[PDB]
Write a protein that binds this ligand. Structure first.
Ligand SMILES: Nc1ncnc2c1ncn2[C@@H]1O[C@H](CSCC[C@H](N)C(=O)O)[C@@H](O)[C@H]1O
Ligand SMILES: Nc1ncnc2c1ncn2[C@@H]1O[C@H](CSCC[C@H](N)C(=O)O)[C@@H](O)[C@H]1O
Ligand SMILES: Clc1ncnc2[nH]cnc12
Ligand SMILES: Clc1ncnc2[nH]cnc12
Lengths: 268, 257
């Protein structure tokens, strides 16, 4: 059917997206509380760390899809890829990453996440080295639209196809419905080499979330709907985990019921 | 002992616990080595009990980071009032407190239990019951009727004895004095400078008795200890900074018999 209308609503809504409110909502306490191991923050970092610790996810290049203003999702990844591409639809997010990349004071402070990543990776790495290395390995920050058949545009700067994809809380957060979600997943898959890996983190059964003035509409998906899409896009699912959001972390910034983590390998 | 009246805690903290000696990122540095010695020792599970006294804490807390989860009642001590105030500022989260968070983070890193550094600090602050005056040159270092529970199940002392003693014999007596605070069977974790004769703390120029690993060992034996472990870190050139003339650092794990 028609994708333009729904997508247009999505683009319109996001023009009001406030990175600082989003950061506050999802990455400052209580959700940003890395001290409780039962919290969502540690669960996120744990999924990534353990996945990369298998040694099975490696290569030269990685593309992070819909990075927004966050970098936690690359902390464990950055030791396994020489070349990392970050991306976002919104200029204000790309600028936010720009501040962190220049190590400015005004930048969001990710050091708790960096340290925690060092803690659970168990190699006694200090967090300053971790951060220095991610900053070195991020080779570009690009505009992206996952609804386009070529999400990075034509003749993009990105090394293609990539050995690996990371995407956290993007697809479900920018797709009006499941069909759109599936197509988004189809589009980003054209960027991954056959046999490459996709690490997909996202919200389960979420219909809305706030980022300042902007209230955004999210397609609520289930674990089984996420599995089907991955199969439908040509992936073998290696791992699919579910975190049930505790009530004390359900804060009125959204209606998220849980979080999913998928490690999928593109068939070919 | 009057020289210690000019001892500036911030200058000392700058000299030993800020970069380069303060950089914890390089595993071959003295900071990580010290934390490593403490952690490994406690990780054995052979150093346990209810009460612990830290001897000559100065204005530093790193020496108890790994210890605090093994002892519910902790006593910190120093000869100088200014050092006791500097400790108070960190314990009470006051303004101007020295930031020990790098060390707390590194202890959590080394200990490998998944603990966030804030929990670590929280526990340490909670278990430190009291900060007391002390003088190891006195037969009763803590004085007559101290608030400290005695005898302690364990002692810790870092860079104190050799730094307050003019010579080996004074060093030996100082050790005899603090040994009286320790329950028989108790454990002593002693960390200290090797072959050092002076160091600076702002306007203060302190004298140090230069001691060897073999001298340290013999002293512990003379005081009634069985040396369970004794290691040396040789101070690399890049950490020899004009603040002192230290050659190495010794770590000793001893058990009172
Ligand atoms: N059409 C589109 N194509 C690709 N990314 C988009 C998009 N529309 C919005 N986005 C980005 O999708 C993100 C959802 S928030 C996720 C932020 C980050 N990945 C983290 O894990 O929190 C926002 O940064 C938003 O700007
Ligand atoms: N006569 C005495 N008896 C017990 N402690 C003394 C003393 N004279 C000086 N001290 C304290 O011995 C300490 C030596 S340096 C501080 C060592 C600190 N524990 C750390 O590990 O870096 C100083 O705090 C000093 O004030
Ligand atoms: Cl933990 C969580 N829940 C809902 N939305 C999110 N976006 C990023 N993290 C999120
Ligand atoms: Cl590493 C080191 N060297 C000399 N004196 C010291 N006091 C505390 N740490 C010290």
């Amino acid at each position: 059917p028609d994708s333009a209308p729904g997508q247009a609503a999505v683009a319109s809504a996001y023009q009001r997206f406030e990175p600082r409110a989003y950061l506050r909502n999802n990455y400052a306490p209580p959700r940003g509380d890395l001290c409780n191991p039962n919290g969502v923050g540690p669960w996120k970092l744990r999924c990534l760390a353990q996945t990369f610790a298998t040694g099975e996810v490696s290569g030269r290049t990685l593309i992070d899809i819909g990075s927004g203003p966050t970098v936690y999702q690359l902390l464990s990844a950055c030791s396994h890829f020489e070349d990392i591409t970050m991306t976002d639809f919104l200029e204000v997010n790309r600028q936010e990453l720009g501040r962190w990349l220049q190590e400015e004071p005004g930048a969001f402070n990710w050091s708790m996440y960096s340290q925690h990543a060092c803690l659970i990776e168990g190699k006694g790495e200090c967090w300053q080295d971790k951060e220095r290395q991610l900053r070195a390995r991020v080779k570009r920050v690009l505009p992206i639209d996952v609804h386009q058949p070529q999400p990075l545009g034509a003749g993009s700067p990105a090394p293609l196809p990539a050995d690996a994809l990371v995407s956290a809380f993007c697809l479900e957060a920018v797709s009006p419905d499941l069909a759109s979600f599936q197509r988004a997943l189809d589009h980003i898959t054209t960027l991954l080499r056959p046999g490459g890996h996709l690490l997909l983190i996202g919200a389960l059964e979420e219909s809305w979330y706030l980022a300042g003035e902007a209230r955004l509409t999210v397609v609520p998906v289930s674990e089984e709907e996420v599995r089907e899409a991955l199969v439908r896009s040509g992936y073998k699912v290696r791992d699919l985990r579910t975190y049930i959001m505790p009530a004390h972390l359900q804060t009125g910034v959204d209606d998220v019921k849980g979080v999913f983590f998928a490690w999928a390998q593109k068939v070919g």
